[model samples]
Target: GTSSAFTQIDNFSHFYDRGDHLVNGKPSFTVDQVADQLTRSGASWHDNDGVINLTYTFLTAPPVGYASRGLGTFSQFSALQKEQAKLSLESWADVAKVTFTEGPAARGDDGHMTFANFSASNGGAAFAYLPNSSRKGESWYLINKDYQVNKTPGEGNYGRQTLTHEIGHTLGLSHPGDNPTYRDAVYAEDTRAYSVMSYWSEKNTGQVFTKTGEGAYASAPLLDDIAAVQKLYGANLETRADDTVYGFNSTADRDFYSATSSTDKLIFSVWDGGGNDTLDFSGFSQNQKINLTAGSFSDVGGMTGNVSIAQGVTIENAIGGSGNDLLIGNDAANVLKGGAGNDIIYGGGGADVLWGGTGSDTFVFGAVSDSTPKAADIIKDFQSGFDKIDLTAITKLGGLNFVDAFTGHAGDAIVSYHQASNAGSLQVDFSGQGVADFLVTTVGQVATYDIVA
Candidate 1:
């Protein structure tokens, strides 16, 4: 819904000849199947371990860009050639367990990637062999027969742009338009959706779709394609229960809430339509890495997408949904964000980053945890007059002549250094949210601090 209909170069066609795909010299993947699990037949190619084998042997180069070869055609390769091929394959492997290995560098292999040279009006620029090969070594050529050097106007079409799309076919994937194998009734309603398999004609450029907020995707394989391929092979190595139905929890039997081994990610989540949620993590560790969001939803960043990550490795931040919400964080490097409405954010311990989005927001910090080390966080775009720091969490700031304990005149932040428990470091709001004796770090800012209980 943001920009354009342009989504990467289209390259050539579903072809190799004047207008035909390769089967009996024509790219007949979707149209026909040779024998068993080969071409557009069954799509059942895998290892004994039950995982779909993503390994493929790529076919090599022909000339350069349709310089021409053989009675029919022959493509060509190397670093520049192989690099382009490698990049296309990597995008697939990143989200899936699919691994592409170098074959004998010839066609009649698992999957092939080589340049071709065809007619200026030849229906297809390049063509890929469907899994219709007789053996594992047979795959399609993902490269086109032409590029910018060959064409006068249609250069933005393809050089390596079609690489990824073609590779999808070699992996037994059908087009979204064709309602390929991973097809379901979900397509009946909204046929034009996100997926590497969807034809350009299947999408609506005017439509807006966002997965991880702060951005949008009118193109590229976002989740639909990811779900499709992962279904073919196996999923990544992590158990995730993110759906709204039977949600997830931190039910792991550990050796008594001690240090978590950097192994499997332990997470707990509950997203019941953000039913005006409130989570009391007081029983959890101040060093606990949890995420919780209330009110509305944010897809990413600090409890985004109306989700919460309550205790886990990687991203264990919390968020409070839209409306006048109150959120809290523990003693881990947490990101506490309050999106929309008048909100309150509490960065309890272990140097946390906090954000109060929209309305009159409050930043709440407690006394001291008496922990070994502490870190301070930077509050970005802090609204001076509208926002308030609820130091009530830390009672040490209650003093008559407390100004001497902290420093910072006007433009600087006045930081308290061990005057109470863990109150340290700089600056007050430019909107005048500071007291005379009950002052802390105040300046342009280095909002680092500590709390001793």
Candidate 2:
């Protein structure tokens, strides 16, 4: 049994932590040491713009010490698990300019790093060495047999994302939380980085709402993770914000959900595929590799386009593809479209326009920020009766408002305070007014119901 100790540079200083670089007790290494270590490796990694350019010399086989015989065999796992780890590593190669070609399995046969396993008593489920001279031109990549890099027949032991996370550590990434500046400077939005570099945190559970953490052990590198890696080596290629698309075409007999994309772009477009399909953008820019801000989404290509949307890049457009789709808008002055489908549209904040093609639809409204001017909304095809209106006033989600239920109509939208006294008038007034019915709330009982024809 050999005792090996691996030390991570702990060098995410000034990495959004404009404060300190102290972790545990020791401060990060001096710049002199950093530069010294940087040059010790055979391969030279320099930032070429955002892409990482490597000096050809380092491309040689970095010899890694492989465990003799076989303590734990990868063959034990199903084919799917092995492929999962392989694909995850290749994904990093795709995003970066690094080259990783698998070679012979026998020790000293080829210094092509390794894809091996560690013994239970050996400590960690997996570990790797950087491309430093310490590796003796070789590094051991060990993993736990029981761990699941991706889903499989039986319940996945760990998540399918476990492999990628370890790979991240191998590729010069310390958890964003490890950055000494993480504790104080980071807020809920930034702290919720679902980046594989970060350890599992309860803070990022579920979706929707800014506080709810998103992107936990995500399949791919997050925007911040990508940027960090790029900063180290450099960006492998360009990731366009506008050219991306994520959705269906023709009746998609399934549902579409939103996942965090780097650069604040979300996968929220739907095509067709007739089945009771639902699209939920529960957590858009809450957390992950990158920090997100107010933005919009439009032009949802059914299948073909890139899947990246940059933060604060362009005017945010919330358009829905054809089908019984539900287009949900956000706090920004969004352009929401129902397209075609018995849909539900929510004008979250900012003045919004609710318009689209045919289909019985429901329009939902609420005030996101109390300070902002009234969350004015313009509803175009108000087919009355056929569609429903659920409006609420206040600060956050689920807040209640006392409104004269069904006070507005098609021709004359809900306008002005109804009762002459205008006492407990809770609702928006834009235009039409008709023989509306008495709308009741589940929480509080209405003082009295009266019909105004």
Candidate 3:
């Protein structure tokens, strides 16, 4: 259903009439013939995979701009060409969702690139996308006009083939970055002749499409990309039993089940117990955090609690309930959600997602760095500001500031520092309010910390 308006060059007479010397004495093919060849070639990859179902509109304009002979500019093209390109890309919902406005500039006079330049430049072309601020879900692609005018010498069907290749890159496929062995087989010959993603030709030769190398000219989507998309939106591979609920009932046993496999999905439900309680998920590994809250209510987890993770951890949905809680994701790619309270969160190393639920909360990066290098004189002072004290001396000069010195309290906690001739340590006292005290220490240069209440 996403297929819509797409512009395809329909002129082949110019190449034939111009006596383009690239092909072996044969007349240049018509626009329809080129499109047909591309479709057939593309179909080879999609045999069992369902038709690509993308609409392609053939533009009646002659291949006069740079795509033909490097004589004109692409920016001078009629408004219709631009509109059609935008419409075609916007038709797909998934493609329209991501933002692509930022990168580079695209557009030239005569609405295309010159033939001489197109073939000589390794097939590279300029393209532009609408800015994110004003992007109403639209994308555009402009092919070099040089390929259409028979300027490329060897490339038998340059226009259609080049268009297909550029469109693939526009859809987020890279030219097999740095790994030539794993490069697409269809583009192998081209990559050897021209640059992998270059818009120009190689060695002054015309645009040529040859399938000699591995992954050469095979411009279809890769398998890994398909799997990633399916994983994000596909149906659940694992499901939970319907009777699972959170909180302790009068008679029911209050126990959490361990996940069977990495793909096992956990559905958490919170009944209207309406009292203060704590739910701990400290035992779960990082990979087992996917879809942990599938059918749960808006608020789950606990009224006021914390969730901590280890390094390289990844939790799809680690959510909190209706109270002030601490969501700590350590050294991993994690997603933390504070459903309702004044939450305190920490994202350790990898890219993490942190959401402050309802009230104002603190989000920290790295371990609590503010309470390091404890001072003995400060601990003796009763009114000294040191609420969230770090007893461990793990704060490096360039380390991240992790701990919130004043956590869950109005004033500072007390920190005690002691230094012997060859040994030194710091202690933080949060015993007055019965809250937890955090300590950070360094062993063999690796820093580790513990939470003591």
Candidate 1 wrongly placed segments (more than 4 Å): 1-42, 50-73, 105-120, 132-161, 179-193, 201-221, 238-353, 356-384, 388-453
- Model 2 TM-score (2 dp): 0.43
lDDT of 1 by residue, 158-272 (tens): 3443555566666666664333332332232122223334443222322222333332211122334444555566444332222121211223211111112222111122212
> What does candidate 2's lDDT look like per residue over 1-453, in tens digits?
110100000111112221135433334433223222322333433232433322111123322333342433332334665566665565555455564555443332222344343444353444555544244222223345454333351111234446565565556655443234434322222222324455433243222212234332345554344544544554444322222223322122211223333223332212211222223222232211111122212212221111223222322344454444445444555555666556566555466666644666555543323112244555555444454444322222232223444445432222333244332222322222444222211111112121111
Instruction: Specify the highest-lDDT model's number.
Output: 1
TM-score of every candidate: 0.41, 0.43, 0.21
Task: Please list the residue runs of candidate 3 whose C-alpha ends up more than 4 Å from where it truly belongs after superposition.
Answer: 1-165, 168-180, 183-335, 338-366, 370-453
- The TM-score-based order of candidates, best leading, equals 2, 1, 3
Consecutive 10-residue window with the lowest summed lDDT within model 1: 5-14
Q: How many residue pairs collide in each prediction?
A: 62, 35, 62
lDDT (10s digit) by residue, model 3, range 1-453: 110100000011121122223233333332222222223211110112221223222333433343554423333323433332232232111211221221222341111111112223343443322112122112223335443332221112333233323443333333322233312233222221222233323222232222244122211111122222222222121222123222222121322122223222222222211222223332222311112221211211211001111111123435554455445443444456554544444444444455544554434323333232231111111111211222222222222222334354422233222333222222332332334343322111111122112
Better of 1 and 2 by lDDT: 1
Looking at candidate 2, what is the lDDT of residue 413? 21
Count steric clashes of candidate 3: 62
